[PDB]
């Protein structure tokens with residue numbers, strides 16, 4: 341699956 345990090 342795809343991953344997004346919103347720091």
Ligand SMILES: [Zn+2]
Pocket residue numbers: 341342343
């Ligand atoms: Zn993945």
